[PDB]
Amino acid sequence: TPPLATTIDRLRDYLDRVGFQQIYKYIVAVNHYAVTPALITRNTAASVHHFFDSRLGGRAEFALLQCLMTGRPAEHAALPDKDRALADALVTAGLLRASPDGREVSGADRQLISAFGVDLLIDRRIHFGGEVHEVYIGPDSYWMLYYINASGIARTHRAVDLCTGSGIAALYLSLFTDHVLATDIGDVPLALVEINRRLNRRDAGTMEIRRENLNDTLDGRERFDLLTCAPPFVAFPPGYSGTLYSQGTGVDGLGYMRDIVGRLPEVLNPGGSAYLVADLCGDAHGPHFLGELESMVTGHGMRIEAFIDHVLPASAQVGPISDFLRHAAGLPADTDIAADVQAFQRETLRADYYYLTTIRLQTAAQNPGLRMLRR
């Protein structure tokens, strides 16, 4: 809407005025900035507040910035005059809260971060409070984008970010090409990527946002030079309900990965490349999914490179998966979810380990083959 659009314009003006992106980059430092979005969290916010208070002297020009970054309250009367009208607009938009007596502003459900040179509003509940969030972002998103060869992107390359969520992959691609498609089906992420597109001075002139199922985009007539996708891929036991952003399709959670890879020879232009990321089950030698990709090498002459950037024994995921299932469905604490997850890992997934894997796939490769990089 026009009032929201103007509010976001003024918010980006504020971020530019006070150098938000540089401050965020300084706080997390260059050895963490691209590792994970979980840097400013409930466990580090006190440290962030101390930095602003003592190293930046508590200057009022950073007050509204901290409401957005950590949720820290700022007294309404202490905001500079230009920041105070913007703060009122953000409260009206539901992007910040006012205290009940109207005397301060503080965090709502959106946290402001930066990643890959882009300013991004994300679901605050993933790093603060702990309540089940409605939009995902994780280190996996970052590791996808890290492996993209940005110098090979032309302005006229057609790129698509499927299952865009907050929009981070689409906004990254929009740094380099003027033709980006970003898709999702959730009302909440779709609203958020609209905001984040405007927040980075973009509009439908160079980035289309589309409400569309993954398989519809992939079956379509559109052809792309570059594709990214971090799709729902978590595998939950039969009977359990996850969330739209987490639960993968198929018996092992990887149905969306299968869907994408199978259509790449038809959806990419020859020589185009796709970047995917998923947490893949496997044995001691590696993720089971890579065995399915040999059909792509032989049948389509692709080059497929898998970058294994984190390994965990399956037993280390039982708690996190069970906790997530318990909270997402509001289950009580006497349910034996842990045994259900274990049995599912053992019997259906055959998962001794989980491999957090980025995969680059190229069509019409001059050096076809499958390559697995492990440390």
Ligand X SMILES: Nc1ncnc2c1ncn2[C@@H]1O[C@H](CSCC[C@H](N)C(=O)O)[C@@H](O)[C@H]1O
Q: Which residues bind ligand X (CB under 6 A)?
A: 136-137, 141, 163-166, 168-169, 183-186, 189, 213-214, 230-232, 244-245
Closer to ligand X at the Cβ: 22 or 213? 213
Nearest residue to 122 (alpha-carbon basis) of 107, 105, 136, 132 = 136
- Using a 10 angstrom Cβ sphere, with 0-12 exposed, 13-18 middle and 19 or more buried, the burial of residue 50 is exposed
Closer to ligand X at the Cβ: 95 or 137? 137
Residue 286 C-beta: closest distance to ligand X, Å:
23
Residue 193 C-beta: closest distance to ligand X, Å:
9
Specify the amino acid at residue 93: A
- Using a 10 angstrom Cβ sphere, with 0-12 exposed, 13-18 middle and 19 or more buried, the burial of residue 283 is exposed
Closer to ligand X at the Cβ: 76 or 360? 360
Residue 28 C-beta: closest distance to ligand X, Å:
17
Closer to ligand X at the Cβ: 123 or 225? 123
Residue 54 C-beta: closest distance to ligand X, Å:
33
Give 155's DSSP letter: T
Residue 314 C-beta: closest distance to ligand X, Å:
22
**Alpha-helical regions (H) of the chain:** 2-17, 20-28, 45-50, 63-69, 81-92, 139-146, 168-173, 187-199, 214-219, 255-267, 289-292, 294-300, 318-328, 337-344
Report the C-alpha gap between 207 and 59 in whole angstroms: 36
Residue 302 C-beta: closest distance to ligand X, Å:
22
Closer to ligand X at the Cβ: 169 or 226? 169
Residue 212 C-beta: closest distance to ligand X, Å:
7
- Using a 10 angstrom Cβ sphere, with 0-12 exposed, 13-18 middle and 19 or more buried, the burial of residue 69 is buried
| Number of residue whose CB is nearest ligand X | 165
Closer to ligand X at the Cβ: 165 or 286? 165
Pairing of strands 224-229, 158-162: parallel
Report the C-alpha gap between 325 and 185 in whole angstroms: 22
Report the C-alpha gap between 140 and 280 in whole angstroms: 12
Closer to ligand X at the Cβ: 62 or 245? 245
- Asked whether the beta carbons of 11 and 199 are under 8 A apart, the reply is yes
